[PDB]
Amino acid sequence: MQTFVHEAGRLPAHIAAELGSYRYRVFVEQLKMERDQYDRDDTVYVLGRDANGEICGCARLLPTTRPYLLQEVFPHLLADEAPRSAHVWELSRFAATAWSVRPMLAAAVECAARRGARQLIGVTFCSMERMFRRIGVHAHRAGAPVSIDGRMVVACWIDIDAQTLAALDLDPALC
Structure with missing residues (x-):
């Protein structure tokens, strides 16, 4: 796939509707608009296409x-x-x-x-x-x-260290 990171403020209308539908199909049907109070203008999203x-x-x-x-x-x-x-x-x-x-x-x-x-x-x-x-x-x-x-979950951490950056093929300079 290809990744797209959106962080320029409020999402363009066509993107919000698209993401909203995908999130509905995944989080609602599998597990149209699925959004909560944490979807704001400052929120950052990454979409895969x-x-x-x-x-x-x-x-x-x-x-x-x-x-x-x-x-x-x-x-x-x-x-x-x-x-x-x-x-x-x-x-x-x-x-x-x-x-x-x-x-x-x-x-x-x-x-x-x-x-x-x-x-x-x-x-x-x-x-x-x-x-x-x-x-x-x-x-x-x-x-x-x-x-x-019914769904087993856990609060999880991910350290952005050498191990993590290497496993994701990211720039080691990111720390």
Whole structure:
């Protein structure tokens, strides 16, 4: 696939409708507009597109110094208080329709790192956690796993270090 990172403020109308539909099909039907209070003008998105230009992946990045999903919707998933630092960004609404997750995560990590992030945190499906592990990034738990309405998830961290950057074929200079 090919990745596209959007971070110029409010999404163009045609992009929002497209992402909204994809997110509806993935998060609603599989697991048309799916959006919550964390979809704002400052929100950063990364979309994956196939050879036909159609969205086949998505991700949402948010600075932890601003309101985020883990912090106010799932605070009980954390062993400790929710992070609030320029060094930590939240990864949410992450999906790919493993060799497909890799590109999406790479674009996600590079963008966050270019923004000062040294770590990523977010509620993660344990099935996705395993794929993160298989890919080789330095992922580790921020809390104990739990099954929410049947789906086992866990607050997960991803360190943006040498290991992670290497596994995603990113510039080692990003730290």
